[PDB]
Design a binder for these strands. Structure first.
Lengths: 64, 365, 313, 68, 141, 191
RNA sequence: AACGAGACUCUGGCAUGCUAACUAGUUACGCGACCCCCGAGCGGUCGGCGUCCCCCAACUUCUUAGAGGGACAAGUGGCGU
C-alpha cells in the first residue's frame, strides 16, 4: 500500500505447507526491530539468514 | 561525566526532532591542508577463503586521538578560517546520534565567535561498542569478558591492529609534503600508524565555516597511475549465540548479506558511524575485515576470516544512509551555541534516555 | 634445574606420524614417516616463527609407511611399509636403489645395522627375516618364531658380537644370536601384547612395553628380570637418551620423561589443552625420538604434527 | 543414505569383542587386520563393515557396561 | 644430465600426456602452437594457467603434449589439466616443497578440474527407452 | 587484473550490487570472475551449490532453449560477446552494471500461488526468495530476445542488448518489466 | 528358526604401487635422409616439423589384463533415550 518497501530477514525455518508442499512457513525478524517477529508464507527455496522484500507486514500467516 | 545541579538546560534536541532537520546542496570541499603518509595494500588479501584461514597479528603503533584545541593545525587555522572546529570522530557521533544507546559527551568550549568541540581526555568517547543496539545488550559487569567495556576494549584493540596488517610498511609510502604534526620527524622507527589528516572545508549556511579533521587509513594500488583510498575498520565477534547473531564461519559465503544484516540490528550505530567517516573522507573503497575470537572463552586470541571491499557511496545507497539529514543535525546544534556567549558548554547523551541537550556550566567544571 | 619448554611444532602431513628418526651425522636433517604414504625429509631452520620446512617428499607406496630408519652415513634411508615391501632410498634426489620383494603381509618394523650390511624386518607373516643390502635373503626365521605378529626388532650395539632383539604380540621378547640363529633366551612378562622395545646405547638392557604400559627391564647377557615400573595406560614407543640415563615414554595425553638414577619422573610434557571431547581430547602420542644433541626431542602424534621440545636449565 | 547395519554384523561383532577383547585398539585399520586373522570374513566389503562396528562398540565399552 | 617427468590428464576419455622436459619456453601441442588450437573461442581457457601464474614459471621447460580421444571440447580441458600438473611435477622433483605448495594454492583456488578429474562418464542404456532414463510413450487408448 | 581475470576485456571491478537483499545470490567478482563462462559440469548436486556459479554463466545457460538450440553452448557464447559489445557502444557503461540492474529490476516483490478450497480456484499471495527472484529475472528477459528474433531481420544479439536496456531503466518496452508488474497486480487483488 | 530384503555377481570411479609386453606404446639416442632459415648462427651445429631408419638400447607413465590395496558413517562438530 502506502507503506514504503520493507526488508526483513529469516531467523529460522519452520516447515513446509500448502497442498503440495509448495509454501514454506518461516519466522522472520524485522531487521529494524530485533524483538519484533512475524510468521510468513514464502514460495521459493530458502535456507536461513537471507533477506526478503516485504511490501507489507500487515499481512500475517496462520495456515496453508 | 557527572551532571551537576547548577548546569542550565535550554533545549532538549530529541532524536525525532533532529531526523527531520536537513540542509541541502552541500558544495564540494576544498582541502585546507593534508599532512601525514600512507602505506600500500597487499593484493594477496583479495583471494582469502574461509578454509585457508590466517590469524591476527597484534600490531602496536603510537596512535594520535588528539582533541580539537590540542590539535595544533585546528588551533592555528582558527586565525585564518573557520568558526566551528571538531575532529572526525566528534563529527561521526553527532551525525549518528539518533542510533545511540549509551552515553557520549563533548565539551563545546565556545570561544568568541567560534566553537571548539573538545572531546575530553578522561572520557571513553571513542570506544567502539559491541552488541549495543541489540534486543537487550550485555548487562554483564566489568569483571566479565562479554561486558560492554571488555568487548569495547576487545573491539578497539583489534580495529587498528588490522589497519596496518592490511598494509606493507616495508614497502614505499606515499608522502604528503607536510608530515604528521602530532609527532616529530625524529620518529625514525616508522611505528606511527598509516594515516594522513585532511583538513577540509564545508558551509552549512548561516555564514558557517566548518574546518574539521578527516582521514584515510590505507591506500591500495590501482592501475593506470591511479590508486584507491580506503578507510579500514574491523568487525569483531565474541559469541554468536549470546546476542542472537550469526556464526560467520558457517554462513559467510551463503548468507553474506544476512551477516551484515546482523549488525544492522546489533551494531547499527557503529556501522553508519564508520560509513559517515568514509563519506567524510570520500574514500574509493570501504574495506572491512571479518575477525572473531579464536576461542569464545578467550577474549585475547582472534583470527582473520575474510575481507571484502565495497564502494562507500553505493554502499550508502544500500544501507539506506543519507547525509542530507546529517547536516541539519549539526546545523540545529549550532543554532543553540552561536547565540550564547563563550564558555565550556556540554553536549551529551543521557545514559538512560534518548535525548541530547546543551548545558551551560560554570566554566572550569 | 633441567626442565622442558615447548619449542615449536612442524606442519606438512595429511597422515598420522608413524615414526621419526634422526642421523647424528646431520642433526640439521630430520626424517619422518606417515600414513599419507610418504616419508618427508625436512630442512630445519631454528627460527621460532616456524621450526622447519619440508625439503623434499619421497613418494611411492600403496599403503602406510610404518617405520623408517636412517643410514649410518646419512646418505641412504630405508623404509618398511604395509604394502609388504621395503625400499632403499638415495636421500639426495629420490631414485630408489632397490625394492625388496618377498613377504605375504605387512612389514611393521625394520632396522638398519651399524656396519650397513644387515637389515632385518618384522612382519605380520610371523617371520623375522634378514636381508642383504643387495636386496636378497641371507636368512629367514621361521623356527622358534613368534606365534603372533612381530612388533619390533632391533640391532644391538655390542663389543663386536651379533645379537638382535625381537618382540611380538605373543607377550614374549626373544633375543637371537646370528650364526646359529637360536633363541638366546625367552623373557616372559607383560599382560597384553607388546608394542615396542629399544636397547640402551651401551647395549646390555632391553626396555620393553606394550598394552600393559608397564616398563619392564631385562638384562641382555645376565638374563635377569631387574624390575617393573608403572608407565601408565599404554606405551607405544620408547627411546633412551644418548647423553643421559633417562628413558622417555610415550603415553596418550602426555610424554613421561623418566630419570633412571634414581627412579623417578622428571616432568610430564603437556601439549595444547584445547577444549574437545571426549575420547582422546588431545591426540595420542605414538612415536618419539631424541636428537643427538640431547637438548631437543621430537614426538609423533595422530593430528599430523610433530611437536618439538627443548631442555632448559 | 540409509545403510542401517543388519543383524549378521551385530551378531558377530559382539562375539568377536567378547573373545578377543585384548587384541582390540580403537583405530579402524588395526581392528580390521585383527578380524582378518582371528576369523575369516568371506567378503572384503563385509570385512570393512564388521571392523567399523567393532570400533564403534569399543568406544562405548570404555564407559559404562553394555547390555548386549 | 637429462631431466624428464611426464603426467597426464583425463576428462571423458580424452587423454593428454604432457611431458615436461628441461629447456626454455615454447609450449606446443601435437607439434603446433597452442595459440592455434581449433575452436579459437575457448582460447583464453587453455592459456589460463600460463597467463595467471606468469610466463616466468615456463622458463625452464619445453612442454609438448600428445592427445587422443574425446571431442573438440573435452580435449581442451584435458590439455589444460595436463600442463597444470606437468609444471607442478617439474617443481616436485627438482625444486623444493615451498615453491610448488604456493603454486598448488593458486590453481586449486579457481579449481575447474585442473588438478582433479571428473568421475562422470556415460551410463548404460536399458530397453524401453531411447535414453537411459527417458521412456517411450504409453497409451491407454 | 594479473591476479583476477577480467572477462577477456571487461572489468568485474567497479561492479556493485545495489541491494542488500539480493547479494549473496548475485556475485561476480569476489573471486568468481573468470575469462569465460564455462564449468567442468558441476553446478548442482546440492541446493546451495546452484548459487555459487556466476551470473554471466547462468545467463548463457538459460539462453539456449526450445529444441534446436539445446546442446550448443558454444554458439550461445557468440551471442553474449556481441551483447556486451553492443551495450557498451550503444550507451557507454561498464556493461555488467547494465545487466545487474536488468536482473534486479525484473525480479518480483510478491507472487501468487494456488490453494484448494471448495473444488474451485482460489488464490493466495505469498512472498518470494531472493534465489527465486534471480531465477525468474534470468528466465523472463531471455524469453524476450527469443520471441522478437522469431521473424525479425534483427539478430538475437541486437534484440537481447535492447532488452537489457529497457529492463535496466524501466520503461515497459521489454517483455520482462511488463510481466513483472502483471504478477504484482494480481498479488494486490487476492491477498 | 526359515524364505524375500540385505549379503552376492557384473559394471563405473581411485594407483607414476606390484606383475609384463616387436599381434601395444613411450622415451632415448645411434642416426643417416627430406624440409625451411623459420629462431642464435651461415646453409653446418644448437632448436623447431613429421616420416623412413631404428637396436643386440632403455623403460612400462600413456594402451592392454592379471594379482592386490582403498571407503568403514572412519575422524571432528551438532542432534537423538
Amino acid at each position: 500500500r502506502v507503506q514504503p518497501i520493507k526488508l526483513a530477514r529469516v531467523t529460522k525455518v519452520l516447515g513446509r505447507t500448502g497442498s503440495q508442499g509448495q509454501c514454506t512457513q518461516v519466522r522472520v525478524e524485522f531487521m529494524d526491530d530485533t524483538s519484533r517477529s512475524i510468521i510468513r508464507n514464502v514460495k521459493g527455496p530458502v535456507r536461513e539468514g537471507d533477506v526478503l522484500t516485504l511490501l507489507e507486514s500487515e499481512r500475517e500467516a496462520r495456515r496453508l | 561525566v557527572e551532571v551537576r545541579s547548577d548546569w542550565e538546560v535550554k533545549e532538549e534536541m530529541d532524536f525525532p526532532q533532529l531526523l527531520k532537520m536537513r540542509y541541502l546542496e552541500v558544495s564540494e570541499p576544498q582541502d585546507i591542508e593534508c599532512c601525514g603518509a600512507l602505506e600500500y595494500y597487499d593484493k594477496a588479501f583479495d583471494r582469502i577463503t574461509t578454509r585457508s584461514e590466517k590469524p591476527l597479528r597484534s600490531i602496536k603503533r603510537i596512535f594520535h586521538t588528539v582533541t580539537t584545541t590540542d590539535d595544533p593545525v585546528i588551533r592555528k587555522l582558527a586565525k585564518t578560517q573557520g568558526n566551528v572546529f571538531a575532529t572526525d570522530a566528534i563529527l561521526a557521533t553527532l551525525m549518528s546520534c539518533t542510533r545511540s544507546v549509551y552515553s557520549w559527551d563533548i565539551v563545546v568550549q565556545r570561544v568568541g565567535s567560534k566553537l571548539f568541540f573538545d572531546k575530553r581526555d578522561n572520557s571513553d568517547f571513542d570506544l567502539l561498542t559491541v552488541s549495543e543496539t541489540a534486543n537487550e545488550p550485555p548487562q554483564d559487569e566489568g569483571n566479565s569478558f562479554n561486558s560492554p567495556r571488555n568487548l569495547a576494549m576487545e573491539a578497539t584493540y583489534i580495529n587498528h591492529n588490522f589497519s596496518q596488517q592490511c598494509l606493507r610498511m616495508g614497502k614505499e609510502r606515499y608522502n604528503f609534503p607536510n608530515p604528521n604534526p602530532f609527532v616529530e620527524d625524529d620518529m625514525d622507527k616508522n611505528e606511527i600508524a598509516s594515516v594522513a589528516y585532511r583538513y577540509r572545508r564545508w558551509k552549512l549556511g548561516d555564514d558557517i565555516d566548518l574546518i574539521v579533521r578527516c582521514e584515510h587509513d590505507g591506500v591500495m594500488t590501482g592501475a593506470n597511475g591511479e590508486v584507491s583510498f580506503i578507510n579500514i575498520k574491523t568487525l569483531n565477534e565474541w559469541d554468536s549465540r549470546h546476542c542472537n547473531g550469526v556464526d560467520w564461519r558457517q554462513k559467510l559465503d551463503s548468507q553474506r548479506g544476512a551477516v551484515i544484516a546482523t549488525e544492522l540490528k546489533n551494531n547499527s550505530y557503529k556501522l553508519a558511524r564508520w560509513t559517515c567517516c568514509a563519506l567524510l573522507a570520500g574514500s574509493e573503497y570501504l574495506k572491512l575485515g571479518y575477525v572473531s575470537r579464536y576461542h569464545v572463552k578467550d577474549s585475547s586470541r582472534h583470527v582473520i576470516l575474510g575481507t571484502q571491499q565495497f564502494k562507500p557511496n553505493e554502499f550508502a545507497s544500500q544501507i539506506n544512509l543519507s547525509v542530507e539529514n546529517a547536516w541539519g543535525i549539526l546545523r540545529c546544534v549550532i543554532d543553540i551555541c552561536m547565540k550564547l556567549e563563550e564558555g565550556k558548554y556540554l553536549i551529551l547523551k543521557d545514559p538512560n534516555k534518548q535525548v541530547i541537550r546543551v548545558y551551560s556550566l560554570p566554566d572550569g567544571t | 634445574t633441567e626442565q622442558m619448554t615447548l619449542r615449536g611444532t612442524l606442519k606438512g602431513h595429511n597422515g598420522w606420524v608413524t615414526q621419526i628418526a634422526t642421523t647424528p651425522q646431520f642433526p640439521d636433517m630430520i626424517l619422518s614417516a606417515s600414513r599419507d604414504k610418504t616419508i618427508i625429509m625436512w630442512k630445519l631452520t631454528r627460527d621460532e616463527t616456524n621450526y622447519g620446512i619440508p625439503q623434499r617428499a619421497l613418494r611411492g607406496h600403496s599403503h602406510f609407511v610404518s617405520d623408517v630408519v636412517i643410514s649410518s652415513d646419512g646418505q641412504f634411508a630405508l623404509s618398511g611399509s604395509w604394502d609388504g615391501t621395503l625400499r632403499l632410498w638415495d636421500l639426495t634426489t629420490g631414485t630408489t636403489t632397490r625394492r625388496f620383494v618377498g613377504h605375504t603381509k605387512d612389514v611393521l618394523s625394520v632396522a638398519f645395522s651399524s656396519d650397513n650390511r644387515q637389515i632385518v624386518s618384522g612382519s605380520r607373516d610371523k617371520t623375522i627375516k634378514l636381508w642383504n643390502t643387495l636386496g636378497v635373503c641371507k636368512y629367514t626365521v621361521q623356527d622358534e618364531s613368534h606365534s603372533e605378529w612381530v612388533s619390533c626388532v632391533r640391532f644391538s650395539p655390542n663389543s663386536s658380537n651379533p645379537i638382535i632383539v625381537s618382540c611380538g604380540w605373543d607377550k614374549l621378547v626373544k633375543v637371537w644370536n646370528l650364526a646359529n640363529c637360536k633363541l638366546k633366551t625367552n623373557h616372559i612378562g607383560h599382560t597384553g601384547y607388546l608394542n615396542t622395545v629399544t636397547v640402551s646405547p651401551d647395549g646390555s638392557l632391553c626396555a620393553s612395553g606394550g598394552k600393559d604400559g608397564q616398563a619392564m627391564l631385562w638384562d641382555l647377557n645376565e638374563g635377569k628380570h631387574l624390575y617393573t615400573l608403572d608407565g601408565g595406560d599404554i606405551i607405544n614407543a620408547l627411546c633412551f637418551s644418548p647423553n643421559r640415563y633417562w628413558l622417555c615414554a610415550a603415553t596418550g595425553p602426555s610424554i613421561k620423561i623418566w630419570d633412571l638414577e634414581g627412579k623417578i619422573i622428571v616432568d610430564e610434557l603437556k601439549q595444547e589443552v584445547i577444549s574437545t571431547s571426549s575420547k582422546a581430547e588431545p591426540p595420542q602420542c605414538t612415536s618419539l625420538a631424541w636428537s643427538a644433541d640431547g637438548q631437543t626431542l621430537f614426538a609423533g602424534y595422530t593430528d599430523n604434527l610433530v611437536r618439538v621440545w627443548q631442555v632448559t636449565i | 543414505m540409509g545403510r542401517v547395519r543388519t543383524k549378521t554384523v551385530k551378531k558377530a561383532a559382539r562375539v568377536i569383542i567378547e573373545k578377543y577383547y585384548t587384541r582390540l585398539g580403537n583405530d579402524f585399520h588395526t581392528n580390521k587386520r585383527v578380524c582378518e586373522e582371528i576369523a575369516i570374513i568371506p567378503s572384503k566389503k563385509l570385512r570393512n563393515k564388521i571392523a567399523g562396528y567393532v570400533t564403534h562398540l569399543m568406544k562405548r565399552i570404555q564407559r559404562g557396561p553394555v547390555r548386549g | 644430465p637429462l631431466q624428464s617427468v611426464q603426467v597426464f590428464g583425463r576428462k571423458k576419455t580424452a587423454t593428454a600426456v604432457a611431458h615436461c622436459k628441461r629447456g626454455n619456453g615454447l609450449i606446443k601441442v601435437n607439434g603446433r602452437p597452442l595459440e592455434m588450437i581449433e575452436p579459437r573461442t575457448l582460447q583464453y581457457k587453455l592459456l589460463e594457467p600460463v597467463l595467471l601464474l606468469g610466463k616466468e614459471r615456463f622458463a625452464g621447460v619445453d612442454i609438448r603434449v600428445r592427445v587422443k580421444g574425446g571431442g573438440h571440447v573435452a580435449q581442451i580441458y584435458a590439455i589444460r589439466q595436463s600442463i597444470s600438473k606437468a609444471l607442478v611435477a617439474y617443481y616436485q622433483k627438482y625444486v623444493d616443497e615451498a615453491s610448488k605448495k604456493e603454486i598448488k594454492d593458486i590453481l586449486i583456488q579457481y579449481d575447474r578440474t585442473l588438478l582433479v578429474a571428473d568421475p562422470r562418464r556415460c551410463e548404460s542404456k536399458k530397453f524401453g527407452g531411447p535414453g537411459a532414463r527417458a521412456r517411450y510413450q504409453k497409451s491407454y487408448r | 587484473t594479473p591476479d583476477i581475470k577480467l572477462f577477456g576485456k571487461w572489468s568485474t571491478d567497479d561492479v556493485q550490487i545495489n541491494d542488500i537483499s539480493l547479494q549473496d545470490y548475485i556475485a561476480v567478482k569476489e573471486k568468481y570472475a573468470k575469462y569465460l563462462p564455462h564449468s567442468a559440469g558441476r553446478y548442482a548436486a546440492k541446493r546451495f551449490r546452484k548459487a555459487q556459479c556466476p551470473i554471466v554463466e547462468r545467463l548463457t545457460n538459460s539462453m539456449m532453449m526450445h529444441g534446436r538450440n539445446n546442446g550448443k553452448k558454444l554458439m550461445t557464447v557468440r551471442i553474449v560477446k556481441h551483447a556486451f559489445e553492443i551495450i557498451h557502444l550503444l550507451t557507454g557503461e561498464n556493461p555488467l552494471q547494465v545487466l545487474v540492474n536488468a536482473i534486479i529490476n525484473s525480479g518480483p516483490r510478491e507472487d501468487s500461488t494456488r490453494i484448494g478450497r471448495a473444488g474451485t480456484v482460489r488464490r493466495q499471495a505469498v512472498d518470494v526468495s531472493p534465489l527465486r527472484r534471480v531465477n525468474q529475472a534470468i528466465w523472463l528477459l531471455c524469453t524476450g530476445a527469443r520471441e522478437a528474433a522469431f521473424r525479425n531481420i534483427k539478430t538475437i544479439a541486437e534484440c537481447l542488448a535492447d532488452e537489457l536496456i529497457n529492463a535496466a531503466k524501466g520503461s515497459s518496452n521489454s517483455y520482462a518489466i511488463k510481466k513483472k508488474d502483471e504478477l504484482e497486480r494480481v498479488a494486490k487483488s487476492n491477498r
